[PDB]
Every structure is written in C-alpha cells, then in structure tokens.
C-alpha cells in the first residue's frame, strides 16, 4: 500500500502510417507544488522503443533502472544483440506488464500509468498501455491521466479507427499531439509548458525531441471578461 508523492501528469500518444508518436511534459509535481521542472518522463529503450511513464516519479526511476538492466542482460551471450535478438517493444511491454501485475497482486504497486510506444522488427506499430493495477489495453490513440479525458477526444478526431492509421502522416499526427499538449496546459493544473516528444518511425528510426514549448496560445479574449455576472467595470 503506497501513496504517490512526486508525480508526473499526462502521457499522450498515437499511431500514424509509418510509426508512433509519444509525448509527456517535463514536470515533477509535489501535490499542488510544481516542484521539479527538468524531469524526463520519456525513456528510450534501444533505437526502436520509447516508454512513457506518468504517476509516481520514484517508481518511474525504479522502472528506468529495470529497463536499463534489461538492455544489459539481453546483451549477455548474445552475438545478435544489435540485430535479430535485439529488444522489441512487445518484449519490453510484456516484461513491464508482468511486473506491474505481480506488484499489484502483492498489494504493493508501482504507482504508474505506462505507455510503451515503438516499432517492431517487421515494421508494425506497437502502442500499448499498462498501469498500477496491471490493466493492459491497446488503441490507435492512448493517453494517461487528464490526457485520457482531453487528448484522446482530439487525437481520435484524426485516427478514429484502425483504417485511419495509413491515412495519417507524421506531420498531421505530430500537429495533433502538439495541439493536445497545449489544451492540457490550458486545463490541467498539474501540467507545464515545457515538454518532450518522441517519434519512432520504421524508416527514419527514433527521433527524440527535447525542450519543446507550448505556443500559439489564445489569451487575448481574457481582457474583455469582467466580473462574474452583473459587474460592468
């Protein structure tokens, strides 16, 4: 039985025609206090997977170490560690999904929601969710926390079902993700303007973008809003 302390908010993601996009802000909240501002919540495993983690940061840091140690262990007695026997997104996910459920079953969970985004060796897109309860699911768009309530609706307008994935380009997909991150900044009280975004493409590979900012924000209309009803001045 835990209670989360230092926390990370929404992780959002979606599939497009050649791969997957995943994003998460760089904030480590401490309740209402916006305590830490240089937190990287997207962690790449190899050159073909990115694990996005929300929830308790101390448990995120534990998961980082497990993934780091997984890469090491995979290399042992493995001549094809950088080729045919390299780590797949599906391997990395299932491992995490096992650990998450084992910990919830011991009544001592890793207080996290995790999205494993990547591209398999055969070129297929991989995107799957797992959380502190060991609940897993997959969808063309996945999001945690507030992202589930606000981002998914916006991302589903682009990719509403499986057949929309080949029609969606990386430019369109990234634009929707960046738009969603702005909406979350408007409305999520535990979000920050600064964020990281990662693109795993089957052709161009892993592109990890750091220090992005929410921009093109509409605040001008606020000047016209006076009082809460009757007040004219």
């Amino acid at each position: 039985t835990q209670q989360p302390i230092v926390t990370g908010t929404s992780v959002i993601s979606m599939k497009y025609d050649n791969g997957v996009i995943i994003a998460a802000d760089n904030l480590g909240s401490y309740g209402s206090l916006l305590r830490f501002n240089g937190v990287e919540r997207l962690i790449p495993v190899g050159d073909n997977t990115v694990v996005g983690i929300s929830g308790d940061i101390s448990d995120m840091q534990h998961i980082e170490r497990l993934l780091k140690d997984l890469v090491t262990e995979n290399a042992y007695d493995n001549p094809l560690a950088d080729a045919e026997e390299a780590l797949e997104p599906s391997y990395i996910f299932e491992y995490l999904a096992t650990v998450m459920y084992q910990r919830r079953s011991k009544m001592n969970p890793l207080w996290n929601a995790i999205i494993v985004a990547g591209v398999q060796s055969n070129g297929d897109q991989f995107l799957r969710y797992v959380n502190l309860l060991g609940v897993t699911y997959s969808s063309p768009t996945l999001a945690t926390g507030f992202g589930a309530h606000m981002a998914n609706p916006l991302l589903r307008k682009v990719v509403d079902r499986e057949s929309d994935i080949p029609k969606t380009t990386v430019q369109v997909a990234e634009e929707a993700i960046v738009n969603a991150m702005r909406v979350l900044y408007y409305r999520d009280a535990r979000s920050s303007r600064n964020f990281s975004l990662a693109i795993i493409d089957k052709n161009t590979g892993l592109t990890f973008k750091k220090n992005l900012q929410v921009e093109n924000m509409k605040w001008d209309f606020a000047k016209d809003i006076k009082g809460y009803g009757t007040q004219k001045i």
Binding site: R65, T72, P79
Partner: protein
C-alpha cells in the same frame, strides 16, 4: 599421505594439492590471452575446430560482464561460465546500490573472493579455469588474470592454457619494445599474431580466432567483439608473421 584426496586440506608442505590439480585442467585447455593497451584492453582466444561440423563464429567463448568488462578463460568451459554468471550478479548488485558501474579492481576481487571461497571447504571443488578479464573504468584501463587458488594480479599482458609459455614469451617482447604504450588497434593485431604463434603448441587440429576489446576511444569504453573487416585485417596480419 592421502592429502590430495580432499579439497581445502593442507599437505605437510603447506599446499592444497586439489587446487594444483585444478591447474592441470587449466594447462590442458586451449590458449587465451589478454593485452593491456593505451586506453583499454584486448582479449583473444584459441578455438580448436574439432570438426568441420562446428558452425563458424557461433560458439562464442569470450563473455561480457555488465557493459564495460570482458572475460575470457581456459580450462573447464562450464566452470568459466559459472564464474561469469556470478560476476554478473556481483556487478549488478554493485550498480544497484552505488549507481556507478563496478570498477575493474573491485570486480576483480569479487571473482577472487568467490574462487578463493571454493578452496575453503571439502564439499566444493576448486574452479578448473584461469580467467583473463578486464575493462575500462573511471581510473582508466585494467587487465587481470585469476587462477583456481583465487590468486589474481594486475597485468600488462596475460596468457593461460596449453600455449601459455609461447604466448608469455611473445607478450614479454611487446612490453620491452613498447614502453610508452601500445595502441588499441595495434593490440588487436598483436593479439591475433600471439594466438597464431601459441597455436604451434596445439597444431593437430586447426583453429578459429576470436577477439574482443574495450577502448576509451575506439569502443567508447564499452566491451565489443572484433568482427568483419577489423577481424580479417588482424587475421591477415597474423598469417603474414608466421610465414
């Protein structure tokens, strides 16, 4: 007498005959060497091709520990694997607690204490391997050689197996002719030659060469296997020297 029948028993000399008997198993094994260089280490080993049926390049004997340490050994191969499995546990629990990857001298003692522990009781057998290993850490490059007794030292060059004396003689010449230091790419070529020269003591069956290396500049401090063009370049260099 009967002092040699049980492990951990002192003879009247003050010797543990069971450990010396384990050394005989090491002496019986194939040749393996280690060469310390400017900013790293190089490991090489003789792989006897018993038959045509052996798949080339697919019976790897050199093992990696963590991401920065290389291990090679001569003698009873399974014993060497058991030792490396332990090393990996030791290295993992070090990194787990102290964050930093295990230093090579620290790692060397972890194996040393474990092998030494197998000379303390009659319910276990001493290790039938001499292990040459090392890597690059915060303090630079380190090469070690560990023996059945648990004895290990730091080395400029190390050799063990059936062609150890031939290899040692060739290693001593390098140390004399290169006081300022040997480069990583040079050490790989020399390693190949020395394995070929040490193969004269095991020349019934022909062999397969296998080399690995850690180097701060060449491999970025990480352990990697020497493959493809770099391997064939080293083989050709060795072929030219024997003739």
């Amino acid at each position: 007498t009967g002092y040699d029948l049980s492990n951990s028993v002192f003879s009247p000399d003050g010797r543990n005959f069971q450990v010396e008997y384990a050394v005989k198993a090491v002496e019986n094994g194939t040749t393996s060497i280690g060469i310390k260089c400017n900013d790293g280490v190089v490991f090489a080993v003789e792989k006897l091709i018993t038959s045509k049926l052996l798949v080339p390049q697919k019976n790897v004997k050199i093992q990696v520990v963590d991401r920065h340490i290389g291990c090679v050994y001569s003698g009873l191969i399974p014993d060497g694997r058991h030792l490396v499995n332990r090393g990996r546990e030791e290295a993992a629990s070090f990194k787990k607690l102290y964050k930093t990857p295990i230093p090579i001298p620290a790692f060397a003692d972890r194996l040393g204490q474990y092998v030494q522990a197998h000379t303390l009781y009659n319910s276990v057998r001493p290790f039938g391997v001499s292990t040459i290993f090392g890597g690059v850490d915060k303090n630079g490059a380190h090469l070690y050689m560990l023996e059945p007794s648990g004895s290990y030292w730091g080395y400029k060059g190390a050799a063990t197996g059936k062609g150890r004396q031939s290899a040692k003689a060739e290693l001593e010449k390098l140390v004399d002719h290169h006081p300022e230091g040997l480069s990583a790419r040079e050490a790989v070529k020399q390693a190949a030659k020395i394995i070929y020269l040490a193969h004269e003591d095991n020349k019934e069956k022909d062999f397969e060469l296998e080399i690995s290396w850690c180097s701060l500049s060449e491999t970025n401090g990480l352990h990697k296997f020497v493959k493809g063009d770099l391997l064939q370049e080293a083989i050709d260099f060795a072929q030219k020297e024997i003739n």
